[PDB]
């Protein structure tokens, strides 16, 4: 995983949000979190091959802090529909 992405993960706030792993400007995985910190830290110790791939292929991680979990739910659904990222099912 790129050092800058590891850094971004470790600095992520304990706040609801949506996160977007990207490669060359293109989203490759979009997810949401009740706590960005907790959820993103899970990528550091990959529990599945897919989590490993997402973290290795990304050259950028964008995070969006949201007002609450209701906003995370709809923003995540909307962005997945818009971008249809490689690793989202």
């Amino acid at each position: 995983m790129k050092e800058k992405i590891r850094k971004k993960i470790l600095l992520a706030p304990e706040e609801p949000g949506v996160y977007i792993f990207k490669n060359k400007g293109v989203p490759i995985y979009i997810g949401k979190a009740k706590r960005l910190s907790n959820r993103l830290r899970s990528y550091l110790n990959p529990q599945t091959e897919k989590v490993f791939r997402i973290g290795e292929e990304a050259d950028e991680l964008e995070t969006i802090v949201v007002m609450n979990e209701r906003e995370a739910f709809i923003l995540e659904a909307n962005l997945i529909k818009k971008y249809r990222p490689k690793y989202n099912v």
Side-chain angles (χ1 to χ4, degrees):
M1 172 181 278
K2 297 200 145 212
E3 177 59 48
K4 63 180 189 82
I5 297 178
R6 179 176 288 273
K7 183 185 179 177
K8 186 130 176 53
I9 288 175
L10 292 169
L11 288 168
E14 289 191 313
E15 295 290 346
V18 170
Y19 60 93
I20 304 138
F21 284 97
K22 308 179 194 175
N23 188 31
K24 296 162 201 144
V26 181
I28 62 169
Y29 185 77
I30 297 175
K32 61 179 172 62
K34 292 189 204 307
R35 294 178 176 237
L36 282 166
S37 52
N38 291 341
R39 175 47 87 125
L40 287 170
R41 278 173 192 247
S42 78
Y43 286 82
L44 302 181
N45 293 305
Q47 288 300 331
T48 66
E49 299 268 24
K50 186 160 115 176
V51 170
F52 177 71
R53 295 180 181 110
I54 290 160
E56 297 302 297
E57 184 178 345
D59 65 8
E60 177 185 356
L61 168 63
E62 172 174 7
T63 57
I64 300 168
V65 177
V66 299
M67 293 187 283
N68 53 49
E69 291 178 21
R70 297 184 76 241
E71 195 181 6
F73 186 88
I74 182 74
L75 178 57
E76 183 211 28
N78 282 352
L79 296 177
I80 287 168
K81 286 190 258 273
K82 189 214 268 217
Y83 291 111
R84 295 301 187 180
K86 202 182 158 156
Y87 293 109
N88 284 93
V89 299

